[PDB]
Predict the structure.
Amino acid sequence: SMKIDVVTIFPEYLQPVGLVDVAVHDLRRWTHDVSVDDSPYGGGPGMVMKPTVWGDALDEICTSETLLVVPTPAGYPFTQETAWQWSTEDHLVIACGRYEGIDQRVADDAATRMRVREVSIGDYVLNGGEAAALVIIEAVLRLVPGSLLEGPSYTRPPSWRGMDVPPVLLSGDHAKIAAWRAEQSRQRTIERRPDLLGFDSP
Amino acid sequence: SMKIDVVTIFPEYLQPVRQSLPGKAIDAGLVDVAVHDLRRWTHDVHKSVDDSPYGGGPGMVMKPTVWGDALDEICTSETLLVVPTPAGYPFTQETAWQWSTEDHLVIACGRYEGIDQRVADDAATRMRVREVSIGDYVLNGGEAAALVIIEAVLRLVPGVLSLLEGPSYTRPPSWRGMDVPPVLLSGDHAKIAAWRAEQSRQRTIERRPDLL
Ligand SMILES: CC(C)N1CCN(Cc2ccc(Cn3ccc4ccc(-c5n[nH]c(N)c5C#N)cc43)cc2)CC1
Ligand SMILES: CC(C)N1CCN(Cc2ccc(Cn3ccc4ccc(-c5n[nH]c(N)c5C#N)cc43)cc2)CC1
């Protein structure tokens, strides 16, 4: 059983969402002035989300048992191992940042009370944490109770536009099929992800 | 000026993209994102998009005939066809930069075990095709990957949307017993830059030693 709370200033973005429930919260619900961001101390372009409103939101939503997940391009990598680890958690809270990110003290303060994980879903830049939250939720939820790249897959018809399904796949020879699929997998891995086999990246 | 077509059996999943597009960019004709239900191209009354895998095994494979028709209609020779797949080449910021100058992206979202390989192979004989993965985790299908790709690419298109960055701070200067690092308030901007560089170095070593 898992509860996931997502906190964001763009709740509309999270709409692509019995053993698990997901709730989306508008961060602005915790403001009292009639501004969630300001210029960074030390200078630089763009804006930083103030810790104040985040603190109030997380105070209400989180407990000491919560795993606080904070997407950030500067995070530890989020991988399938991470997804397995998080799949048995009772409560994930995903704090989605915007602008140039969230004041570091939010994560620091939270860590005095609960476990906090700053993670990145990949080596590219997004405009905010929301798309990352969707990826994280999908990867985690498909593992909730109740190495090499996959090779190519085929289905009917056996000939299409003059392109044949590899004849071994029609042979019914399980061992030959297993061996061919292993070869395709190791072949694809060397070409596309040599790092997975401990080789230099292109 | 970019057109993105997305093909998926879950068009409602692509709602956030439409949500994040500024009216100014659309009205300026800088971007157009269209989402297409793959079932529009099915052949049968049951609107079938999947079938059992040759060679056996669990799961299902998306049908080449349906996908072939969809891509035939939507793609041209100038299209960059993007196919998310857990077996893809890595999608990185370099990829996003390259794709940000394209006239036409088509993103083919798979489900189940993926798409019959002949779809991409056939397409590759008359347009540029890119099978890519957005990270080392497993999703249910290509839609969440498409959301990530679209955002990373479009934010590099003017006015449409190394080391790790260290921590950032803003007001108030003191909060829950934690002061902003005094160096940031020092007015010594060479020192501030050096402090930020060291923070970046330390964070990269701790979180991403692979980048070093
Ligand atoms: C890699 C560094 C060297 N460069 C790049 C980052 N630059 C700063 C910068 C630029 C934009 C944003 C937008 N933003 C706001 C909140 C937020 C949360 C997650 C993500 C996010 N992006 N990519 C991922 N894999 C993410 C995850 N998970 C992005 C977010 C935040 C921060 C600085 C330079
Ligand atoms: C990774 C393999 C070694 N093992 C794992 C589990 N099985 C493979 C398997 C499992 C689920 C799916 C679901 N699926 C259908 C279409 C599709 C497109 C993209 C993605 C996707 N997942 N992760 C990414 N970074 C992606 C991207 N981009 C996933 C997709 C497709 C394939 C078998 C083996």
About this structure: The pocket of JEH (ligand 2) is lined by residues A 148, 150; B 84-86, 88, 110-114, 133-135, 137-142, 145 (CB under 6 Å). The CA atoms of residues 170 and 180 of chain B lie 8 Å apart.
